[PDB]
Amino acid sequence: KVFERCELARTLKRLGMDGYRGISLANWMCLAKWESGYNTRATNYNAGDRSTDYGIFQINSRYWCNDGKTPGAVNACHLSCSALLQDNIADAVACAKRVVRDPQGIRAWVAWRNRCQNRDVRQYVQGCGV
Ligand SMILES: CCCO[C@@H]1O[C@@H]([C@H](O)CO)[C@H](O[C@H]2O[C@H](CO)[C@H](O)[C@H](O[C@@H]3O[C@@H]([C@H](O)CO)[C@H](O[C@H]4O[C@H](CO)[C@H](O)[C@H](O)[C@H]4O)[C@H]3O)[C@H]2O)[C@H]1O
Ligand SMILES: [Cl-]
Ligand SMILES: [Cl-]
Ligand SMILES: [Cl-]
Ligand code: NA
User: Fold this and answer.
1) Residue whose CA is closest, atom 36 of ligand 1?
2) Phi and psi, residue 39, nearest 5°
3) Domain of 34?
4) Which of 1, 2, 26, 49 has its CA 20 to 30 A from that of 32?
5) Ligand 1: residues within 6 Å at CB?
6) Could you give the CA distance from residue 111 to residue 113 in angstroms, rounded to a whole number?
7) Which atom from ligand 1 is nearest to the alpha carbon of 59?
8) Among 92, 89, 94, 103, which Cα is nearest to 22's?
């Protein structure tokens, strides 16, 4: 599914993302916007390294979920990558929380560094009731 902005913001808030390991809801929204356009079914094969990015946060198969076809990969979220393509984003949120338990936090996603870090991210949550 493709979420509408404020629908996603409320969804993420209910799932406990606001302030998770210091990351405001607006930062998660900016991340989802730029990675997938709020689209849970999105995929992107990385021909450079044979991994694939999955779902609304474009979580990558080398460390985070198992797709079987990524060489030398691990599955830290304990999920099939299929779980990251559901309309219900609970498993994607649990996995995003796992990603940010590692040292680099929200910086794990270069898109967040490019498009969200040190920016005014307030617009992503304006008017959503969060
Ligand atoms: C085996 C010895 C080290 O193992 C440790 O355990 C890893 C995890 O905690 C899971 O068990 C640790 O991972 C951390 O260090 C490794 C070193 O290779 C990586 O730097 C991890 O970061 C991830 O690696 C990136 C690429 O897969 C490889 O460069 C990931 O970025 C990609 O996925 C992101 C989230 O989906 C995002 O999509 C980025 O845009 C992608 O490029 C990054 O998450 C690091 O946490 C390891 O120490
Ligand atoms: Cl911030
Ligand atoms: Cl679903
Ligand atoms: Cl920062
Ligand atoms: Na409003």
Assistant:
1) 59
2) -110, 115
3) 1-130
4) 49
5) 53, 58-60, 62-64, 74, 76, 99, 102, 108-110
6) 5
7) 36
8) 103
Reported resolution in A?
A: 1.1
Give me 100's structure tokens. 């940010």
Q: By what method was this entry solved?
A: X-ray
Q: Quote the tokens at residue 82.
A: 């299929």
The CATH number that applies at residue 82 is 1.10.530.10
User: Residues, the chain, total?
Assistant: 130
How far apart are alpha carbons 113 and 1 in whole angstroms? 25
What distances in angstroms separate CA 5 from CA 20, 68, 97, 114, one per listed residue?
19, 33, 20, 20
Residue of 73, 79, 84 lying closest to 41 (CA atoms): 84
Number of domains in the chain: 1
Host H or E run for residue 60: strand 59-60
Residue given tokens 């270069």 in the structure block? 110
